[PDB]
Amino acid sequence: QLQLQESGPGLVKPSETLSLTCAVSGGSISGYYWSWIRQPPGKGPEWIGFIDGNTVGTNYNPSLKSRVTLSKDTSKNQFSLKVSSVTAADTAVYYCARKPLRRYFWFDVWGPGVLVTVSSASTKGPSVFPLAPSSRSTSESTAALGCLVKDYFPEPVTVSWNSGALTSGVHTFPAVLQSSGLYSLSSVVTVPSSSLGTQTYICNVNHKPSNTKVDKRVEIKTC
């Protein structure tokens, strides 16, 4: 029932210091080794290092030894990674993982993984526009409600519907890279056509790098 929750900025300017924190719930830091792994989008995993949960012992990747630092706060039951002199080669999805205390190196519990982007551009919150229900494309008496997420500089944007209550029929498409460097995506959801007027639909957009949280209701524009 171990739960790892990752916190930290999504955007880091070059030559700055990236700082990530893995908070552990349902278990203590002691009794295990705690590791940081990173995966550049399109590549495989790379081991950054781990820290002992009981003692002060830490081990790092030799290729990253001079820039990375792992620490732990036992009072808050969490650990942390910091990477100095960050460049574009450090853009990746960062996971925290658990490893048994023994001298074996298998990772069985992983965190969600926070995307970290190293760019000189500024963060831009998303503009969210509802997409009125269209039934020409959908089949068997159902419509498709949409939400368009336009012009947000970092990549991770999460979209849910009805505060996570509506899950079936939801499809969030991969984002597009505008010529201005900003990202845009669309989240569509197929709903029963005979339920448009009686059921309210709200798309929840969360863009954590800009700390922006919008909730746009998709009301029927035409009929």
Binding site: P45, N61, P62, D108, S134, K150, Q178, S184
Partner: protein, 215 residues
């Protein structure tokens, strides 16, 4: 020495046996450090499949087996299902570097996936994005197996050159592909023309959707 080499991709028929190799050296697994096999789906953390070269955790199907010989390990999958399409990595300890190393990855693919025609949904702009001068046509394309797909936009009759941004096709959970094309337009451009069309071409077949600025 001190590297884990994997094939970039392996292919096999459904229901048959396939093997993924992991080539080490004398420092990592000629050392006898265990080979570990992780499975990862798009947009998910790596899931641990094999440890100690043949051991499966609780909750891993018996169709995944591991073997180790000399400086080479192998992950064998029998009775290939479409759900086995993922990325497979091998990891091992290295005493020369004193570090955990991963392989660059193997992309597994089954060969028995039939062709699928794409479904297309065209959303016109709303007054919200119109008055904010963020008006854009949204063309969502989904559920087509052959990843290759070509997108064009038409202004009444005529190809639109500028304002179009088309994503690369991406695998969804059902192993089919999805993509989207956004056409950016100003309010004058939207109100001036009579209709805009998104045309999606896939394996010699065409699906065209059209919208009007009516009111």
């Amino acid at each position: 020495q001190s590297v884990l080499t994997q094939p970039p991709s392996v292919s096999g028929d459904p229901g048959q046996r396939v093997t993924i190799s992991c080539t080490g050296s004398s420092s990592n697994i000629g050392a006898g450090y265990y080979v570990y096999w992780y499975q990862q789906f798009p947009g998910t953390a790596p899931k641990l499949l094999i440890y100690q070269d043949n051991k499966r955790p609780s909750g891993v199907s018996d169709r995944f087996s591991g073997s180790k010989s000399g400086t080479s390990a192998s992950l064998t999958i029998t009775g290939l299902q479409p759900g086995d399409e993922a990325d497979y990595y091998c990891s091992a300890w290295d005493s020369s570097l004193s570090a955990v190393m991963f392989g660059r990855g193997t992309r597994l693919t089954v060969l028995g996936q039939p062709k699928a025609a794409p479904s297309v949904t065209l959303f016109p702009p709303s007054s919200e994005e119109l008055q904010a001068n963020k008006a854009t046509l949204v063309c969502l394309i989904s559920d087509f197996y052959p990843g290759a797909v070509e997108v064009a936009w038409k202004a009444d009759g005529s190809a639109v050159n500028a304002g179009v941004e088309t994503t690369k096709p991406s695998k969804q959970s059902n192993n089919k592909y999805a993509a989207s094309s956004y056409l950016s337009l100003t309010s004058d451009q939207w109100k001036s023309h009579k209709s805009y069309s998104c045309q999606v071409t896939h394996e010699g077949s065409t699906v065209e959707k059209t919208v009007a600025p009516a009111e």
